[PDB]
Structures are given as C-alpha cells and as structure tokens.
C-alpha cells in the first residue's frame, strides 16, 4: 500500500529494470514476483522497476543495479522507499534519445542495434526522465526517456511505439 | 492481461 523504506544493496540480477527483495520482505509487502514497483530516491527522483525475490538478499535491503541507483541519485547503503505500482498502463508511444558523450562516432541504426533487443518481450516499466544504459554489439550507449504516453509512467509493451529520432542530448 | 505480462517478465528476467 504505502512506501516501505529499505537499504540499497548491489544487484545480483544485473538488469536496469529489476530490483530484488528477500521473500519474507516480499510477503510482508504483499508483492508478487514480476510486479511493477515505484521507487523513490533523492532529489525528488523516482524509478519504476520489476520486483523479484532473492534468497541472498537481507530482509531490510533492496538490490538494484548502478543504472537504477544513478536514476535515484543514491549510493549503496542509502535508504530508498518502495511501493506497489499496479496501475501503470501500457505505453502508446515513448520517445528516447541517446546521450551525446556515449554515442561519439557511433554509426548505424540505434533502434535495431540497441533499443529493439533491449525492450523485446520484456514489458519494461519506464519513467519520463530515466537514463538507461544499453549494450549493442560491444558498445554501451546511454539513452534518456524524453517523453512517454501516458506520462510519466508506462510499460513498454509489444505494441508500444518506440521513437528514437533527433540529435543526441547533453 | 496482467498475467501475460508477468509470464513474459519472469521468462525474460528470472529464467
């Protein structure tokens, strides 16, 4: 129902969309594996993620990778809050742009090489303003979610239109 | 359905 405070720990599922809780904590919070959750960090920042259970996670800790920590402006050992987010809708359209200093000199089709395999059949939840790192080939590029419909939260479903067009941003 | 989303997420992210 309400936000629950937990201590940030390092990910064992190294994926931008996944946070891990212990099974006792998931039971306490009425969460099912695969639920969408809303995380609140510092500087008014938020993130939406998929929660999974983890038999190595301390009860009062939450595991998340560095991409999510950076989106929340937190470090390991900081405290964030987690709450269920079951009302997030499938996105009609999303608009993402690469970050200039991660695409320097990169040519080709950013959707085909990076975004399409990243989102494919994953139902990733995303928030407007998210920065996420995607590897394609052997280069890793950062993208920013510049707009979503609906806003500011949506789930990138198979039918969600993914737009990536225009200058890299700073 | 919410449950098809859950099935696909667990297939992709938890084996």
Swiss-Prot record, chain A:
Annotated phenotype, changing residue 111 to R: Severely reduced binding to DERL1
Result of changing residue 159 to R: No effect on binding to DERL1
Phosphoserine, modified sites: 17
Subcellular location: Cytoplasm, Cytosol; Endoplasmic reticulum; Nucleus; Cytoplasm, Stress granule
Outcome after substituting residue 77 to E: In CMT2Y; increased ATPase activity
Post-translational modification as stated in the protein's UniProt record: Phosphorylated by tyrosine kinases in response to T-cell antigen receptor activation. Phosphorylated in mitotic cells. ISGylated.
Family per similarity comment: Belongs to the AAA ATPase family.
Entry function: Necessary for the fragmentation of Golgi stacks during mitosis and for their reassembly after mitosis. Involved in the formation of the transitional endoplasmic reticulum (tER). The transfer of membranes from the endoplasmic reticulum to the Golgi apparatus occurs via 50-70 nm transition vesicles which derive from part-rough, part-smooth transitional elements of the endoplasmic reticulum (tER). Vesicle budding from the tER is an ATP-dependent process.
Disorder named in the UniProt entry: Inclusion body myopathy with early-onset Paget disease with or without frontotemporal dementia 1: An autosomal dominant disease characterized by disabling muscle weakness clinically resembling to limb girdle muscular dystrophy, osteolytic bone lesions consistent with Paget disease, and premature frontotemporal dementia. Clinical features show incomplete penetrance. Frontotemporal dementia and/or amyotrophic lateral sclerosis 6: A neurodegenerative disorder characterized by frontotemporal dementia and/or amyotrophic lateral sclerosis in affected individuals. There is high intrafamilial variation. Frontotemporal dementia (FTD) is characterized by frontal and temporal lobe atrophy associated with neuronal loss, gliosis, and dementia. Patients exhibit progressive changes in social, behavioral, and/or language function.
Name used for this protein in its record: Transitional endoplasmic reticulum ATPase
Species in which this protein is naturally found: Homo sapiens (Human)
Classification of source organism: Eukaryota, Metazoa, Chordata, Craniata, Vertebrata
From Swiss-Prot, chain B:
Gene, per the UniProt record: RHBDD1
Positions of region (VCP/p97-interacting motif (VIM)): 2-15
Species of provenance: Homo sapiens
Biased composition (Basic and acidic residues): 1-15
Factors inducing expression: Up-regulated by endoplasmic reticulum stress agents that induce the unfolded protein response (UPR).
UniProt name for this protein: Rhomboid-related protein 4
Taxonomic superkingdom: Eukaryota
Role: Intramembrane-cleaving serine protease that cleaves single transmembrane or multi-pass membrane proteins in the hydrophobic plane of the membrane, luminal loops and juxtamembrane regions. Involved in regulated intramembrane proteolysis and the subsequent release of functional polypeptides from their membrane anchors. Functional component of endoplasmic reticulum-associated degradation (ERAD) for misfolded membrane proteins. Required for the degradation process of some specific misfolded endoplasmic reticulum (ER) luminal proteins.
Expression tissues: Expressed strongly in testis.
Subcellular location(s) of the protein: Endoplasmic reticulum membrane; Mitochondrion membrane
Family: Belongs to the peptidase S54 family.
Complexes and interactors: Interacts (via C-terminal domain) with VCP. Interacts with ubiquitin and ubiquitinated proteins. Interacts with BIK and STEAP3.
């Amino acid at each position: 129902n309400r936000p629950n405070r937990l201590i940030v720990d390092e990910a064992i599922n190294e994926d931008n969309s996944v946070v891990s809780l212990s099974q006792p904590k998931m039971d306490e919070l009425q969460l099912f594996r695969g639920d969408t959750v809303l995380l609140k960090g510092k500087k008014r920042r938020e993130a939406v993620c998929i929660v999974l259970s983890d038999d190595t996670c301390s009860d009062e800790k939450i595991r998340m990778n560095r991409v999510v920590r950076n989106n929340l402006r937190v470090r390991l050992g900081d405290v964030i809050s987690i709450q269920p987010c079951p009302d997030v809708k499938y996105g009609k359209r999303i608009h993402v742009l690469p970050i200039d200093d991660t695409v320097e000199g990169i040519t080709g089709n950013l959707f085909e090489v990076y975004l399409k395999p990243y989102f494919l059949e994953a139902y990733r939840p995303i928030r407007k303003g998210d920065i996420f790192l995607v590897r394609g080939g052997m280069r890793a590029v950062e993208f920013k979610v510049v707009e979503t419909d609906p806003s500011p939260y949506c789930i990138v479903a198979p039918d969600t239109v993914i737009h990536c067009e225009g200058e890299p941003i700073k | 359905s919410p449950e098809e989303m859950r099935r696909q997420r667990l297939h992709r992210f938890d084996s």
